[PDB]
Design a protein around this ligand. Structure first.
Ligand SMILES: *[C@@H]1O[C@H](CO)[C@@H](O[C@@H]2O[C@H](CO)[C@@H](O[C@@H]3O[C@H](CO[C@H]4O[C@H](CO[C@H]5O[C@H](CO)[C@@H](O)[C@H](O)[C@@H]5O)[C@@H](O)[C@H](O[C@H]5O[C@H](CO)[C@@H](O)[C@H](O)[C@@H]5O)[C@@H]4O)[C@@H](O)[C@H](O[C@H]4O[C@H](CO)[C@@H](O)[C@H](O)[C@@H]4O)[C@@H]3O)[C@H](O)[C@H]2NC(C)=O)[C@H](O)[C@H]1NC(C)=O
Ligand SMILES: *[C@@H]1O[C@H](CO)[C@@H](O[C@@H]2O[C@H](CO)[C@@H](O[C@@H]3O[C@H](CO)[C@@H](O)[C@H](O[C@H]4O[C@H](CO[C@H]5O[C@H](CO)[C@@H](O)[C@H](O)[C@@H]5O)[C@@H](O)[C@H](O)[C@@H]4O)[C@@H]3O)[C@H](O)[C@H]2NC(C)=O)[C@H](O)[C@H]1NC(C)=O
Ligand SMILES: *[C@@H]1O[C@H](CO)[C@@H](O[C@@H]2O[C@H](CO)[C@@H](O[C@@H]3O[C@H](CO)[C@@H](O)[C@H](O[C@H]4O[C@H](CO)[C@@H](O)[C@H](O)[C@@H]4O)[C@@H]3O)[C@H](O)[C@H]2NC(C)=O)[C@H](O)[C@H]1NC(C)=O
Ligand SMILES: *[C@@H]1O[C@H](CO[C@@H]2O[C@@H](C)[C@@H](O)[C@@H](O)[C@@H]2O)[C@@H](O[C@@H]2O[C@H](CO)[C@@H](O)[C@H](O)[C@H]2NC(C)=O)[C@H](O)[C@H]1NC(C)=O
Ligand SMILES: CC[C@@H](C(C)C)[C@@H](O)[C@H](O)[C@@H](C)[C@H]1CC[C@H]2[C@@H]3COC(=O)[C@@H]4C[C@H](O)[C@H](O)C[C@]4(C)[C@H]3CC[C@]12C
Ligand SMILES: *[C@@H]1O[C@H](CO)[C@@H](O[C@@H]2O[C@H](CO)[C@@H](O)[C@H](O)[C@H]2NC(C)=O)[C@H](O)[C@H]1NC(C)=O
Ligand SMILES: *[C@@H]1O[C@H](CO)[C@@H](O[C@@H]2O[C@H](CO)[C@@H](O)[C@H](O)[C@H]2NC(C)=O)[C@H](O)[C@H]1NC(C)=O
Ligand SMILES: *[C@@H]1O[C@H](CO)[C@@H](O[C@@H]2O[C@H](CO)[C@@H](O)[C@H](O)[C@H]2NC(C)=O)[C@H](O)[C@H]1NC(C)=O
Ligand SMILES: *[C@@H]1O[C@H](CO)[C@@H](O)[C@H](O)[C@H]1NC(C)=O
Ligand SMILES: *[C@@H]1O[C@H](CO)[C@@H](O)[C@H](O)[C@H]1NC(C)=O
Ligand SMILES: *[C@@H]1O[C@H](CO)[C@@H](O)[C@H](O)[C@H]1NC(C)=O
Ligand code: NA
Length: 743
């Protein structure tokens, strides 16, 4: 109250910070109403917001200094590096909202009961902390005066945790979120008659569907990301106010049951096992439906035409089912509000009706990937002015013809995916006018010609995927201006020339795959200036000279974060004929079926069956890392391997096989702790196998055959694991698994 007490409480909080300089304008002889982070009314402090400031202090400092302020109405400390746990404290009765999200609060969730000191508390957000529920679930939260409680993203593992929260009553509760825990058991919110928002998603619920009682107030129901399979239809039948219903990522089955459609705006049944065709009774929702997600089920049939009246539908996700027929334009154009259209991974056939060019001017995302669409790409597409299309996903179809340069009109285009098709012609230089294009993916086509240098104008280019084409020429110098590139893969073309030394300017460059081309010259030492390079595949080319030791200078300082989250497939080498080269083909694979990897048989000499790994890219570190994959096999590299080769603790494959490398294996190779595969076969390596290699503990595969090696095999680590074949054609070589070292 009194200004003297206000200032001293606040400054005592500042004086406890490890870095007092985080609150620079907080001074012991100014009015706190002038402080950054402070809100005042009539010269009295009412709210404090130090969110996203690394205060690095325990909750004891908060409760004793800030939460004791008389008249403080709200305290926001989201992502402030608060740790410790909530304990008893004297709480101003004016405090109504407390945001302690995204901190390091620990202890059992029963600690939050001590927040009952706050007689006026109505909003509590302790999400993204480490509260848990050890031992028995008993007692109660005893915060029944709350209107909004968010316990999401904690470490709460237990059954009937929800009952524990609401045990003491929930008449006042309007918004409950406990998502992202490991909670199970029953959800009984029938006594919470003013509950409008319920999010129990991403938990461990596998038994009863939540019981909603009269469901008088519920507008938002999210039970997705569990293992539910019960009769949710009966559970929500009385939910006349339900605006959002998310039951996706569960174990539900059967046809689409009855649903409350009066107020329904968002409906997701995605990632379940629902069957049948889209029922007609869903037309009742078209007065209000703004988003529909039926993706990832066993639906079939055409798109019912009642969807024509769904004029408010902004997103229509039907992907990964078995819908067939031609592109139902008769219905799509009536969807005046449609902004996202996802029919991917279906069996929609036919050519692209001309009327499709109209949707370009309203859609933001047109996803038709993985279907039976034939014919060419509409040249008249995007010819409608002020087009708004941002994502065009047509990959894995049967499109023929050329890439229409008119796609340059789609000025708002950020991602372009024409891969896995039969497109001929060249890459039009007009694509360089896409000032916002980030993803350009055109791999597995029949594109001839050179790469357009007009891409130097695309300063936002992030990925550049052009594998399996007939491209000739060199790497255009203009791409140096594409400094945001994090993925460039040009393999299986007929490219020539060298790797430009400006490759080291691309600090975001993480993956660089150039295999099965005719690149020449030495390895640029500037590849060591790449702060993000983690995947380097140069196999089957004409590189010569020696390996520069400088390319491994960024080891221990590599960052790999922008590259994470990208769908890929890794096709392990068949290990059969000498035709298949390299460890494996890392291939971009967004919106493509692995079943259609048979198309690679006409372009890749490898056996694909039982050798295709997939998923989303996930580097083994966030910072202070190194290179992960290094394959320069099938070239003409000479000289000796530099000792710096062993400075990559995250390298799990190293293939230098089929070259002209001389000298001995550096003992530093034994520092490659993470090495899974080590191929050095078909070279001129001489000397003994360094004993330090017996320290490699994760080698699932080695091959030192066809060299000039001699002496005993380390035979102290994993070398006995391997069959003789991996050591044959080394005359002087001996020791198990080879014949014993004799005179
Ligand atoms: C109906 O219910 C369903 C199911 O419950 C629900 O679907 C979930 O929706 C949420 C929110 O949309 C999803 O969670 C988010 O997923 C994001 C994607 O994570 C991937 O990509 C990350 C990189 O993102 C960047 O790059 C990618 C690729 O270049 C690009 O697409 C992105 O736009 C972006 O630029 C990547 O880091 C991540 O990998 C890490 O995380 C995953 C776990 O998610 C882990 O498995 C990996 O090992 C790795 O650690 C992954 O590949 C992601 O952006 C996002 O995270 C941000 O937001 C959260 C808060 O939402 C913050 O906590 C976080 O700090 C980030 O800011 C978040 O995780 C979720 O995956 C969906 N679940 C399913 C099953 O689909 C619907 O939304 C509901 N619908 C409604 C309510 O209408
Ligand atoms: C660098 O790129 C060029 C292309 O630019 C690659 O050369 C291509 O290689 C293709 C695959 O070898 C080849 O197509 C094949 O052609 C023959 C007839 O000529 C067909 O029989 C093949 O399809 C049929 O047979 C294969 C047989 O099995 C495959 O896998 C096993 C694995 O050991 C091998 O024995 C065999 O070599 C096959 O690869 C079946 O898988 C098929 O389903 C089908 O029944 C192929 O279509 C192209 O003609 C050829 N291109 C050129 C320009 O000559 C080149 O190999 C590549 N090099 C690399 C990556 O190192
Ligand atoms: C309790 O605190 C947590 C932690 O702050 C809080 O969760 C956070 O909520 C915000 C807001 O919803 C999330 O950020 C959103 O993320 C999604 C996906 O990227 C977007 O839809 C949102 O965009 C909105 O904001 C943009 C910027 O203004 C707008 O351009 C856009 O139109 C949208 O309005 C938004 O960025 C954030 O990710 C979470 N954080 C975590 C860690 O989950 C939670 O809401 C709080 N609980 C309560 C009950 O208030
Ligand atoms: C790496 O190769 C380049 C390109 O030339 C190839 O390799 C040569 C050794 C020879 O076999 C050529 O027919 C190949 O096309 C080399 O540049 C060549 O340098 C050599 C040696 O002085 C010379 O005879 C050629 O004329 C050069 N070619 C050109 C186009 O200027 C380069 O020197 C090779 N690097 C090493 C370390 O040998
Ligand atoms: C590719 C995308 C990555 C990004 C980060 C670039 C990342 O997302 C991946 O997870 C990557 C690091 C995976 C996919 C394929 C896996 C292969 C499988 O094939 C084998 O069998 C190999 C031989 C042997 O079995 C060995 O033990 C396992 C081997 C080497 C693994 C290694 C790890 C993977 C490479
Ligand atoms: C998710 O729920 C399942 C099922 O309730 C849990 O598995 C049970 O674990 C207990 C404790 O060990 C066992 O007594 C049961 O036999 C298990 N049941 C089954 C069907 O396996 C599982 O542990 C939960 N997971 C988490 C992360 O909480
Ligand atoms: C998915 O749909 C396809 C396409 O309809 C089904 O395969 C057959 O398709 C032909 C038309 O080309 C129909 O005459 C047949 O009746 C379809 N078969 C059956 C059994 O319905 C395919 O079976 C469907 N299922 C899956 C899992 O893809
Ligand atoms: C690719 O590998 C698969 C196995 O992953 C091979 O499958 C063989 O199939 C033939 C008949 O076509 C059988 O005689 C073999 O016994 C199978 N081998 C297995 C299952 O290991 C397939 O032949 C390989 N393809 C090529 C071209 O070599
Ligand atoms: C909170 O973080 C500080 C700063 O690292 C640390 O010294 C302290 O031990 C932490 N407190 C608890 C209770 O873990
Ligand atoms: C459509 O392509 C799928 C594979 O993506 C195939 O199973 C199906 O038979 C094809 N349909 C027609 C009519 O060609
Ligand atoms: C390309 O980068 C060079 C300098 O490396 C610069 O002179 C040139 O103007 C850049 N191009 C564009 C279009 O900005
Ligand atoms: Na081109």
């Amino acid at each position: 109250q009194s200004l003297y007490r206000e200032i001293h409480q606040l400054i005592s909080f500042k004086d406890v910070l490890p870095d007092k300089n985080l609150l620079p304008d907080w001074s012991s002889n100014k009015n706190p109403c002038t402080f950054d982070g402070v809100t005042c009314r009539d010269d009295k402090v009412t709210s404090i917001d130090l969110s996203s400031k690394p205060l690095n202090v325990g909750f004891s400092a908060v409760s004793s200094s800030l939460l004791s302020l008389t008249g403080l109405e709200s305290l926001f400390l989201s992502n402030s590096h608060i740790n410790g746990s909530v304990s008893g404290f004297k709480c101003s009765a004016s405090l109504t909202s407390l945001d302690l999200s995204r901190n390091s609060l620990s202890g059992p969730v029963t600690t939050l009961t001590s927040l009952g000191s706050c007689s006026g508390l109505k909003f509590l957000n302790v999400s993204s902390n480490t509260l848990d529920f050890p031992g028995k679930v008993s007692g109660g939260l005893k915060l029944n005066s709350l209107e909004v409680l968010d316990l999401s993203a904690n470490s709460i593992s237990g059954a009937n945790v929800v009952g524990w929260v609401l045990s003491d009553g929930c008449g006042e509760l309007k918004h409950l979120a406990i998502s992202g825990n490991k909670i199970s058991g029953d959800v009984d919110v029938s006594r919470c008659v003013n509950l409008e928002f319920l999010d129990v998603s991403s938990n461990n619920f596998s038994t009863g569907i939540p019981f909603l009682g009269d469901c008088s107030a519920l507008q938002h129901l999210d039970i997705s990301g569990n293992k539910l399979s019960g009769d949710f239809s009966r559970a929500i039948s009385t939910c006349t106010e339900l605006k959002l219903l998310n039951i996706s990522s569960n174990q539900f089955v059967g046809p689409i049951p009855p649903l409350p459609l009066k107020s329904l705006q968002y409906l997701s049944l995605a990632e379940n096992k629902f069957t049948g065709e889209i029922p007609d009774f869903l037309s009742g929702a078209c007065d209000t439906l703004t988003g529909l997600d039926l993706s990832g089920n066993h639906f079939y049939g055409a798109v019912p035409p009642f969807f024509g009246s769904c004029s408010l539908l902004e997103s229509l996700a039907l992907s990964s089912n078995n819908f067939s027929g031609e592109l139902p334009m008769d219905t799509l154009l009536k969807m005046r509000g449609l902004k996202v259209l996802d029919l991917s991974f279906n069996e929609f056939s036919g050519e692209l009706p001309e009327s499709l060019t109209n949707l370009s001017a309203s859609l933001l995302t047109l996803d038709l990937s993985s279907n039976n669409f034939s014919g060419p790409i509409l040249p008249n597409l995007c010819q409608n002015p002020k087009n708004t299309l941002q994502e065009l996903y047509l990959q894995n179809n049967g499109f023929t013809g050329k890439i229409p340069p008119t796609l340059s009109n789609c000025s708002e285009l950020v991602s372009l995916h024409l891969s896995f098709n039969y497109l001929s012609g060249t890459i039009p230089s007009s694509l360089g006018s896409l000032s916002k294009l980030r993803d350009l993916k055109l791999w597995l086509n029949m594109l001839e010609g050179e790469i357009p240098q007009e891409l130097m104008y695309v300063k936002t280019l992030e990925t550049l995927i052009l594998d399996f084409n007939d491209l000739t020429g060199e790497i255009p110098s203009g791409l140096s201006n594409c400094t945001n590139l994090n993925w460039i893969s040009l393999s299986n073309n007929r490219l020539t020339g060298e790797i430009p030394k400006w490759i080291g300017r691309l600090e975001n460059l993480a993956i660089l795959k150039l295999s099965n081309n005719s690149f020449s010259g030495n390895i640029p030492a500037e590849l060591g200036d790449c702060r993000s390079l983690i995947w380097l595949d140069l196999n089957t080319n004409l590189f010569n000279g020696t390996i520069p030791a400088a390319m491994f200078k960024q080891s221990g300082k590599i960052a790999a974060n922008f590259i994470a989250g990208k769908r890929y497939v890794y096709i392990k080498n068949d290990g059969m004929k000498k035709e298949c080269h390299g460890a494996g083909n890392l291939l971009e694979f967004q919106g493509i079926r692995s079943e259609q990897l048979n198309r690679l048989s006409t372009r890749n000499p490898c056996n694909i069956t039982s050798r295709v790994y997939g998923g989303h890219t996930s580097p083994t570190f966030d910072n202070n890392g190194s290179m992960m994959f290094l394959d320069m096999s099938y070239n003409m590299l000479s000289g000796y391997i530099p000792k710096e080769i062993g400075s990559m603790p995250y390298l799990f494959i190293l293939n230098l096989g089929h070259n002209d490398i001389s000298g001995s294996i550096p003992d530093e190779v034994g520092d490659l702790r993470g090495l899974n595969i080590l191929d050095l076969s078909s070279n001129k390596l001489d000397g003994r196998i360094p004993q330090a290699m017996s320290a490699l503990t994760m080698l699932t595969e080695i091959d030192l055959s066809n060299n000039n090696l001699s002496g005993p095999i380390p035979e102290m680590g994993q070398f006995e694991t391997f069959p003789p074949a991996k050591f044959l054609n080394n005359p002087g070589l001996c020791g198990y698994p080879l014949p014993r070292c004799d005179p």
